[PDB]
Each structure stands twice: as structure tokens, then as C-alpha cells.
Design a protein around this nucleic acid. Sequence first.
RNA 1: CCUCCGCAUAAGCCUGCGUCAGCUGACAAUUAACAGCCCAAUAUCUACAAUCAACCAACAAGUCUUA
RNA 2: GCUACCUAAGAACAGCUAAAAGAGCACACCCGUCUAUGUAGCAAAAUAGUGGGAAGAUUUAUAGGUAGAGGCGACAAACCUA
RNA 3: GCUAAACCUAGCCCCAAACCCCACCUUACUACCAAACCUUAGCCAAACCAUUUACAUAAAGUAUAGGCGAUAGAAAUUGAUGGCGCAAUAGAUAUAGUACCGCAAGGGAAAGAAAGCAUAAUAUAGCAAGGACUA
Lengths: 45, 139, 97, 199, 117, 176, 47
Amino acid sequence: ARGNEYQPSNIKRKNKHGWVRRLSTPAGVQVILRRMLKGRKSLSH
Amino acid sequence: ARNVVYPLYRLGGPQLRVFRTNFFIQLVRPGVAQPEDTVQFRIPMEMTRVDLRNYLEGIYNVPVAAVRTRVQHGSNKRRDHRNVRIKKPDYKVAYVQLAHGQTFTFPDLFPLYSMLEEERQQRQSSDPRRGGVPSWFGL
Amino acid sequence: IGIRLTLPPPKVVDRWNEKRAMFGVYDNIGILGNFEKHPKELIRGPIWLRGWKGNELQRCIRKRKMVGSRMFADDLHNLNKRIRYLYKHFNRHGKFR
Amino acid sequence: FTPPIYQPKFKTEKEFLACTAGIFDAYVPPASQVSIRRIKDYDANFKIKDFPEKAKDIFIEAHLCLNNSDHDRLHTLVTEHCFPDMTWDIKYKTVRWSFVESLEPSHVVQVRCNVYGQITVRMHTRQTLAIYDRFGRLMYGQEDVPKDVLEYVVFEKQLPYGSWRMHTKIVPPWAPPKQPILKTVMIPGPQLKPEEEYE
Amino acid sequence: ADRMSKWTSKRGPRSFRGRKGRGAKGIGFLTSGWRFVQIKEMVPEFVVPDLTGFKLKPYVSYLAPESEETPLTAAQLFSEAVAPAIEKDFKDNLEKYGFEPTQEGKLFQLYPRNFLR
Amino acid sequence: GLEEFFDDPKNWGQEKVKSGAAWTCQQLRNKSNEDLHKLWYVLLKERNMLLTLEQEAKRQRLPMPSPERLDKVVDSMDALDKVVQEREDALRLLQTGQERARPGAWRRDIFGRIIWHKFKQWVIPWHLNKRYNRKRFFALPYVDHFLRLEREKRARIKARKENLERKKAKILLKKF
Amino acid sequence: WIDGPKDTSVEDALERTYVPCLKTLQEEVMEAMGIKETRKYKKVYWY
RNA sequence: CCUCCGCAUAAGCCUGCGUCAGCUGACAAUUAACAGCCCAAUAUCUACAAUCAACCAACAAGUCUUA
RNA sequence: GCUACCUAAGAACAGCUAAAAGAGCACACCCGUCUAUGUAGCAAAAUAGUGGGAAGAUUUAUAGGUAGAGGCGACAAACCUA
RNA sequence: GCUAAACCUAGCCCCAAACCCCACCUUACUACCAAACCUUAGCCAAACCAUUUACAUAAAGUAUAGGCGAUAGAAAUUGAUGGCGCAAUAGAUAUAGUACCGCAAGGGAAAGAAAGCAUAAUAUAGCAAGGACUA
Ligand SMILES: [Mg+2]
Ligand SMILES: [Mg+2]
Ligand SMILES: [Mg+2]
Ligand SMILES: [Mg+2]
Ligand SMILES: [Mg+2]
Ligand SMILES: [Mg+2]
Ligand SMILES: [Mg+2]
Ligand SMILES: [Mg+2]
Ligand SMILES: [Mg+2]
Ligand SMILES: [Mg+2]
Ligand SMILES: [Mg+2]
């Protein structure tokens, strides 16, 4: 019954975790800054 | 041209001209049967079919009747020893139909060791009657 | 199996290199030089523990006091956490009271 | 309820020249002064009247080296074209080759010629052989009874620091058969496929 | 879910796939009815010269002499293009010698560059 | 004609093709603008032919005949481009004093990093450009801590590199 | 060395046809090829 | 002998049983008409469902621009 | 991106009986009454049969919204990525 | 005799010194349309908890503060390149912030140069041994 909580949709993916939304708020900008400091290859989703 | 900023055009402005073209194309043998008048090219991704028509008609004086393009996705499945995906580059493929009933067919391109070879000639393989006994000795 | 099967490469120690040969010179700089310089001024090391000694809590307090402003951000955070932890340990844990 | 814990996937995805090719002009047993000069002009010191002694010494010493498998010396004693013949079939078996006084004096036969020297020397000596197995059991030739050996040995030399080394032994077709082998041998006939028949 | 693969026009839904391109430069615009109007002046025109009678070749004979690289500089160009005329007129208003006060009014403006390659 | 995409028919199948030397920057600097313009297309046609050869060799699983001429042609075209760029840069410096063909400015992005923002061509002034005004070219105070952290990460990398270099030098001296 | 059909002769490769001028390759080639352009490039904004 | 199966579109995925030679590597491939990517503005306009829309039946009252 | 509720604009509902129905029987569809199986399973809640609704307070695709002492809730302390 | 065992530098730690072409904020990496600033809290200690505690040297743990209790706590004044480090389970998480896991924030690796069996199953009875015994 459970396990399939991920129902992929690129629109939701980008609107929820994308670069633009991350930069839309100071908290998201700090998310990006933390990923950059850690050296993540993928800063945003 | 590619990797260059195009001067922004406004109504009534001069024609956009490129003097030293940056596009380099390859004429490739089709992987599938094609009509006699179709020529297959691999093209830079930034090249339009209009650009390819003008390119072939100006640099090679090839009468072009039609041009079609498709973006072929290069496999991203292969992985190196570190489990990191190796991306085969995506590339643009153009199909150019020649005009005036002109026909094209891809040409049939591609139509110390002496000592080693002569020693292989002079191997002198051991005979079965020798039973593994070295035959070099003269006794 | 926790034993190496080959003798380690020979270790050759030059007991008479310059460092060993001149080790200890000027340790009596004071008593033999009219006390112009104290022997502790011969000590080369961290600025916060030149000519000084203490347990880890005191060392960390001194380090923060003397170079805390020059420390990297996460190193200073670690030092503050360590001082807090050591304070708790030394003042609340132990067999003796 | 407690969720299952998955172990990392990586743990379970793991997966595992100074030689010539033969003889420039083969000598056929039952005028080479140009080649003599062609070697003199490049060597600056040579004696045909004394070469046979040195050639015999090299031959005997190399054959003695074969006894102890002295490959380090054998490399310098024989050419690379000859070394595989010298040392391949004899691997994993002891040979007790020995030399005894010769029967007739060795003399040169003919010489020819980036540039590689070549001297053919005829020897009719007397030798002993005893080739054993890995297990030390004789398989060729008595160690005590000597045999007379007729050999046409061809030496090759590099023309700057190379020397005269055994290059190839010419066996004439009229030479007598070699010694018989102690052990018997079976020689399979033509293997037959299911659809084939013997004829 | 694939964060590492590059984002291309092959990935999203129909709208995404239509909207994203592959870097090809624009040629015109879209009017009502999604009718594409191609502007001729936006299309790069290849100014290909006449190669008939041209002596140069893709390769150079190895017999050519070696030389020392001397990258052209503004000073060198000025000496080789303007200094002669300046001297000849000084011995005997810089537009006469070539200088132009402003790039505006030219077809090929040097800055901001407005020509391809 | 499409025959220009292939080498001379006599060369088809040849194990090796004899080729000259790549044009050098100095050799090209002596040629006129028209001569360079024409040589560019000569080299372009040769490059297209060589790329076609490379691809057909890959297709046939055979070694490409004399691959070095492709490198020679690429080097020649790069030298020609460098020469033309040098001429354009010299002319631009003389006539305008600008060292860069494209307008740009040093700006601090939303992440506090100093970047060379290269300008883009627009039709409306920037204060009216909505998309442009969405882009932020300033860093708010919450970025200062991350700037310090990045600086200290760089410092740590540099310090490790320097100590490693010195230790390797010490080991070399001990060895010799 | 023997020049191939696609190798420039030494004299051709060394001929100094370059006349130091204050013209870009684009405008020089426009003049040489006789391409006539009367439309004036409308000004654009950079930022 | 068996199948609410199958074929398409959407969404998702992204080369993931095409060829070749040794699961790996190389080579090839999906070609726009379908679909997406639109619209020059200012204003002024636009009461009258749908249900085969014609009767009949209502209530829950229902995507509606020219100068 | 599950789920609860909501917003926008969509879509589906055979056949028979009945007539404009939170109507009857019953497909698709939705659910999950009872039994058996399964219980490291096909499945971190399934299978087979049986059963409830099936033109509605229905089901459902798409996009958007509500956020943690908060949301949402036909109150089960239900749900808010097992 | 199998599996295996081993290895030494890849690097790291702590100091000192020194201040360190093109594309991309729209669905990022897409050529081109009319707006920031604002007390940290709490864990924890007080054996609960509620005020409180808990984000050079010397003067001095002094004056002071404090459910005057846990505890907190001055100032005047004084003047000041190296390694008894690690050496691949260590040392950085690091071969890499990669693979992989997660919708997301985020988490985050591994690695390079004996045991177990087989030769050779097993004998009444038993913490498997000990005293022994010719055994
Ligand atoms: Mg869903
Ligand atoms: Mg298409
Ligand atoms: Mg019905
Ligand atoms: Mg009903
Ligand atoms: Mg409900
Ligand atoms: Mg209740
Ligand atoms: Mg209850
Ligand atoms: Mg307490
Ligand atoms: Mg004080
Ligand atoms: Mg480690
Ligand atoms: Mg064992």
C-alpha cells in the first residue's frame, strides 16, 4: 500500500525545489550557500 | 557561428552577416537506407536548418532542396570505474535532400616485424617422434 | 595475522646532526647571562602556550583568550564547545569531590 | 512498527635488434674475400686463421652453461634468434652435456654480410649427452659413451660492441639420424568427425 | 529524481519540451496562431569569398623558415599604420589619420562589438 | 559540391597521407584580411573533410589515415582566429581604449561572490526590464558568514597544499 | 621534402600581403567583396 | 493453451533485448504535417445555459469582443 | 509529487429497470464486509473468492494553496512522504 | 593448498609565518519587453523547578552578585618553520562531498600495495579437560 509516495512530475519538482524557488527567499539562498560550502555537485533540484 | 553573442537585430537594421563561420559539419554514412538524394550530416547543436542550407549553398555550392534536423541523445548509461555516468555527447543530425534530381551516394572510403615473421616461418616445431626431447643438439 | 611478515626498512638515526648536537644550548641563558632572557623565551610553539602549562580546559581557555579572534569559524565553534564540555566534565564528573 | 534499514548498495554491487632472421645465404655442404674485407673495414682487428679457436671456445663454454642453466651468460654467448632454441625445450629438465677432445681441427667455411656479420664454421667433434626429466630419470643419450658430432655453426655479430655468438646450426638433409629415444611414442591418426569415415 | 544529468528539452512535459531549446539562435518571432515569421535580417548570411585562383592551402611546406612570434599590439599597429602619415604631416583633427571619436554611426562598431566573429 | 567533403579519390584507402605543416601565427600575421578570410574557408573545408574521415573511420572500425592533419588544421584555424582577434583587439584599443569587446562589469551576485557580469543586448532600458530587475546583484548580510566559511575553506586547502609540498621537499632532501 | 597538392609553396606562404590598416576584417572584406549595406545598426541597451 | 488483454496519447524515465565483436565495448538511431513554443495595443463590448435542444422537465443557475 | 482539506480548469460513469432520482440491479471505476492464503510474503498491508457504492455528499488526471503547538480533520488523536 | 595473510606512501593533523569564448535568478546554466535591518531560545546545573546557571601574567577566585544557593564575578594597578603527530578501520568525510540514500533540507561511503575449509567424516560416556597410561 505504501512506499510509492514519489509520483514524479518535473513541474512540481522544479516549482518546489528549483533554483528559482531556492533564490526566492533568504532561507533558500542560505540552502544554496550551504550546498556550495559543502561542495555539492547539485546545488538545486 | 557558435559560442558568440549575436548582435541584436531591430526592425530596419542591417543584415546579420558572419564572415568566418565557426560551424564545422561532418558528412556521415546513414545507418539506415536513405533515398538516393538524401545526404546525412552531423551538425553543431547551435546550427539551424536555415543555417545549414545557407552553409551548404555558399561554402560548397550544393543545391539544397530540403533540410530536416533531429537531436540525437547520446547515452548517459555507461559508467566509469568510479560508478560515475559517462555522457556520450548529444549531437544534431541533419538530412539534406538535394535539388534538381541530383543524387549522392556515400563513397567507399577504405576500399622487426620481418624478423618476427621469418622466425615464425623458421619455428621448426618439435616432431612427435622427438617425444619432447630437444632436437637442437646434434647428437 | 596482525604481524608483519617482513622486517621493516632499517631506521638510521643520526645522533650527531646539528639539532641533536646543539640541543639544550642556551637553556641556562638566564643564570649564565645576567638574567637578560628567561629560558622560557627560548620556547618556540603556539603563541598561547609559550612558557605556560595547564590541563586541557585551561589550555582551551587560554587559546580562546589569546587567539580566539584569529581562529577559523568552525575551529572556534569547536573550541567553545570543547570548553563547555570540559567545564561540565571537570566540575561535575569524577571520583573525588 | 520499526522501518526496515537498507544496507548501502555499493557493498553488494561489487564486481571483480641485434639479430637476423635466419641465414642470408644458406651453405649447402656436400670467393668470400669481398665479405672478408667488408668485416675487416668495420672491425679493424680480426684473424681468420685464429677465429676457429675462439669459435670453438665460445661453443663449448655456451654448451657448458646450458648444463647449469646459466642464462645470464647464455644471453651473451648466443644470439637472441638462437636463445629460444637453446633454452626453451630444455626447461624443466637437467642436461649433463660435456665435451671431449675434438677429432679434426675446426676451420671456417664461408662468410657473408644495420650490418650483421656472419661466419660459417665446420666442426667434427666428439660430445656426450644425457638429458633427464624433471624427476631425474634419463630420457636421451648415455652420459658415459660419447658420440661424434658434425656441425655447421653459423655465428652472427653486431656491427659496434657485439661479439661473435652462435646464430644457427645448419643441419644438412644427408646428415645421419640422431640418437633414438628411450621411450616409445604414439602418433594419433586423423581424428574423425561423426559424419566422417576412415579411408 | 536525476539531479546530476543535464537539464535538456527532452525531459519535462510537453510544455517544457517545447519551451526549452538547444542553443540555436533565434531567427524570427511568433505571431497569433503560433505562425512563425522568419526575419531575413536575423538569419546569419555566410559571406563566403571566391576561392578561385587562391594560392594558399590548408597546410604549409615544412621548408618554410622558422620565425619568432611577435603578437600584434596597439603600439605596433599605430606605428605601422598611423605613424608614417603623422610624421609626414607634422614635418609639413585626427580623423584625417584614421581616428574616429565615436563608434556610433559605423556598421561595424568596435565597442560594444556588433558584428559576428 | 559534396565531393569536397572527401579526400582526393586517389587517397582513399591509403594507410598514410602526406601533409604539410600547420599555419603558424607569425606566418599568418603577414597575410591580408582578405587572404585570411579566404584561408579561413580553405581550412574550414579541409576541417570538414577531415572530420568526415574521422567519423567514417570510426564507423568502419579502421584507423584514420594520418590523423595528425586534423590536429594541424585545427591549430591552423586557431592561429588564424588568434591573429584576427589580435588585429581586432589592437584596433579596438586604439579607437576606443577598451580591452574587452563585450561590455561587462564587476558585480556582487546574490551569493556575495564577485563576478564579471557580461552584459546582454536588450531593447528596453534596464530600469524597465522586469526579468533583469528580478536578478539580484547584491548580497544581504546573511551571506557574510558563508563568505567567511568559504574563505577559511580555501585557506585550509592552501595550507594543506603548502605543508605537503614542504614535507615532500624534506623527504627528497633526506633521500638525496 | 616534397610539397603535396594541399601544401603552400614557401614563397606563397611568406608573401607579406598584410597592409597594416585601421579596418576590421569584416569591413575590409565587405569592401573587397562589394557587399553594400546602407541600413544603420539601431542602438541597443547593454546590461 | 491462456489474457480486462492489446495499440496509442499523456505523465514519468532517459538509450535501458537495434548491428557488430569480446554483461562489456564500439557503431548506429527518433527527420513534421502530430505536439509544444503564440498573439500590438487602447478602450468599448458581451442578461437570454446544457442536456441530439426542437417540445417536455427544472434547479444546483452553469468558459464567455468588435472600431 | 503520500495523505487531509481547499482553489482553477478538465475527464469518466456499459447494459437493463426506471423516469429528471444523494432511485433499483449490475460492468468499467472506487472501496475494503467476511473467509482462506501469505506473515523476511508477490507485497514494510498483498492474493483469491465474497461483498458495499457505482449520475453522485461520486471517482479521477493536471497545476496551485494551507507547515509543526502549526496545518488539515463528515473527531478516528485521523492525516501531514512507509 | 585454497581462502587469505602481510606491506608504505597517497595523503592528512597540529603549529609558525604570511592577511587570502558562450550560458546561467524564467523551470539556473535559457541570445532579444514597460525589494534587507528587529532581545536567541532551550538542553543543562541547582540532584525536581519556578529567580538564577548555561551562548599574557598578577591583583584574584579578591571586591562584588546570588531561591546570599547552585553558582556567577570584576576593576583600579602590573606589563608582555617545526613535530617523543597519524600512516589506508589511523590521519581530513575524502581516491569524494563523489557513488549511494532522501521529494527536500540533508545524510554520506568503500577502497591501493587468523577464522573458514581441504588434505583427512564417524565409535558406548557425557563443559570435552585433567590424573594418567605401554596405549
Ligand atoms: Mg497523486
Ligand atoms: Mg523535429
Ligand atoms: Mg449507467
Ligand atoms: Mg444510486
Ligand atoms: Mg473526510
Ligand atoms: Mg472520539
Ligand atoms: Mg480515544
Ligand atoms: Mg535540574
Ligand atoms: Mg585590568
Ligand atoms: Mg580513512
Ligand atoms: Mg587456518
